[model samples]
Target: SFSGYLKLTDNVYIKNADIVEEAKKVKPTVVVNAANVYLKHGGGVAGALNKATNNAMQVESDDYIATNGPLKVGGSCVLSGHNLAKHCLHVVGPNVNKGEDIQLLKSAYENFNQHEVLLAPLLSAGIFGADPIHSLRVCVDTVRTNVYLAVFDKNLYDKLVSSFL
Candidate 1:
């Protein structure tokens, strides 16, 4: 269950739960997709979104870049429909090979902070393979909307215990 809540801001929150579960708990007005600069929904959060919501995201990605639009890293594309959310912000986090790219991570979060309710996964670690703490800090600094970081691990409590607990 949603037992711990670390309010990042007046509206944003950090909670421990499966990203999938968090989506169910909060029917997001917007769902942020960590994507490719060219907007390919391959794996990780992108794959989950594709499996859960169908091609709504890709269709919108196509519409967004139909003429002359290839949103680069740190850039964004918003998609919306009955199948997806009220909005979907595709912010391409880096395809990290060795280490964290702080500026790119910041760029991803800076793209949108308007949705009253937005669901997102903690990008840049594990499958993301980037600096986790740095990625987390960026999320903390950028959210201007009501947001939640859905993490599925109990040890995550240790990370939040100091300031949030």
Candidate 2:
């Protein structure tokens, strides 16, 4: 099982998994949680989203959106979850190596937040290999001023951010 810390602000501390469970407790508000979800075969990335959306629907949630940052591969098709939620946002940020993922995510997030339509590819245009260090740097620089929501785990987020620094 993957684990991490979440700091909602400067002093709050919470476990990532526990935050997800808490999101389940509150149905209607938009709950955004981040995780290192693997898309490998037999991994439960899609399944978890399905189950979460199913639970949300049961509770009459207008929508259940899951936003994952980036991974090695397989995040493209997960966008199908949009059908499940009133609107689901799957952000494939820069991979641990490639720096483009963060730019892509920023653009996507901005456009989506503005209710604008995007015509970009889900995958990084056949650029298979990426540099993890570069990607981490981009993530750190971007998130410093951009990310303002409740991240699931503060420790994990700090560790991940520190890698870039």
Candidate 3:
């Protein structure tokens, strides 16, 4: 039912182009850098990765999942298999005893760009065993600037608002 085409563009490289001048030429709609935007939601029974995938497909958006838990019990994030969405899912969690929640968030942001609509779950509470406040704080402090945070907890929502203000 859903489909599209894939177009590959030629690669261009500037050895030492002026930063400002180069930026002007591209005329990007938005620039995403730094961290503070993470997409956190509840994963299905199968796991956070599975749940995030289902949720993204239902909303017709791209999904990017990441796991920073122990190696034995880690999960993978799922993105739609769509072309435009750049459907990319990352599974980088499941350490021995600690969760790489922050690193996973960074990975998700790393995969996003101005043209892509990034979406993910609030992984702190569920996968990382982090409280709502802590999760939001980590997300806000580690996600990319252009990325959007799609969380499922009221506490996280409040904290996010407060952090921005």
Which candidate comes out best when scored by lDDT? 1
Ranked by TM-score from best down, the candidates are 1, 3, 2
Top model number, TM-score: 1
Candidate 3 deviant stretches above 4 angstroms: 1-79, 82-86, 91-116, 163-165
lDDT of 2: 0.32
Candidate 3: residue 152 lDDT (0-100)? 41
Per-candidate local distance difference test: 0.66, 0.32, 0.33
> Worst ten-residue run, lDDT, model 2?
117-126
Off by over 4 Å in 2: 1-19, 29-47, 54-87, 92-101, 115-154, 158-165
Q: Model 3, 8-116: lDDT tens per residue? A: 1121011122212222243333321111123333332113332334555323322222433222222334444322133434333322126444445444333443233
- lDDT at 76, model 2: 28
For candidate 2, lDDT tens digit of each residue in 97-136?
Answer: 4443444544323322322221111122113233333433
Give the per-residue lDDT of model 1 (tens digit) for 9-122: 676677776655556555567777777766666677777676676766676666767765787767777776235456677777665864446567777777756556677766
Q: How does each model score on TM-score?
A: 0.77, 0.35, 0.38
